[PDB]
Amino acid sequence: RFGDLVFRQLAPNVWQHTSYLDMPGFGAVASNGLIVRDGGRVLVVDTAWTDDQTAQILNWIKQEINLPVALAVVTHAHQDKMGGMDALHAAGIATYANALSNQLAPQEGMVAAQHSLTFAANGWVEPATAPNFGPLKVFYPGPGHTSDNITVGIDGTDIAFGGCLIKDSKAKSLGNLGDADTEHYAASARAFGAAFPKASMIVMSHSAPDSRAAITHTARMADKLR
């Protein structure tokens, strides 16, 4: 039911879900997402690589929490974050993604979410496109690792999730630059830091949670791209 995945409590109301890619050509690549308990409900950030693993996420919530799952947000269109979209849809869960991510989805061989988020000129999601997100604060830093990458803070916790935008403080490099925007990358990573200026824990797309140092390390590496 929920065997393959790893679930790690990061705060009383917040857990990290981790799933591993099984595909020929690849190592077992970790992908992280978040489960957030808000009062009498649960919110999910990102799926797992596959429908099956994503369903395991829902089974864990059922067994370990036993509150209904209100909504899911995906932070960019890639298999690792979007892979299980139809598992969410099949469970009757409302899904949200940046409009651009929904547009990119089919190009990526992935299913789009049900609703498109839009963003104000200052980078903050428009509350009309993100009803009842509660503690979830959603920000679009501008183009970075990808053009569609979005970021989320969790109110009352001091954790923020950069998605693919922020690399670990130990990272040798910025990783896959295929979708990257060379000139705006540094500015985007710094905008993220200023958007969640109080967050002491930055959740990573692949490795373990890091500190604000990751943000600085990333921006400085991106400074050399230009």
Numbering used by the authors: 45 to 270
Direct quotes from the study:
NDM-1 has been reported to be a highly potent carbapenem-hydrolyzing, zinc-dependent MBL. NDM-1 is an extended spectrum zinc dependent β-lactamase capable of hydrolyzing nearly all classes of β-lactams, impairing the ability to treat life-threatening infections with intravenously and orally available carbapenems.. NDM-1 resembles the common β-lactamase fold, although it shows low sequence similarity to β-lactamases deposited in PDB (20–33% sequence identity). Our results show that NDM-1 is unique among other MBLs due to its enlarged and flexible active site, and explain the observed extended spectrum β-lactamase activity.
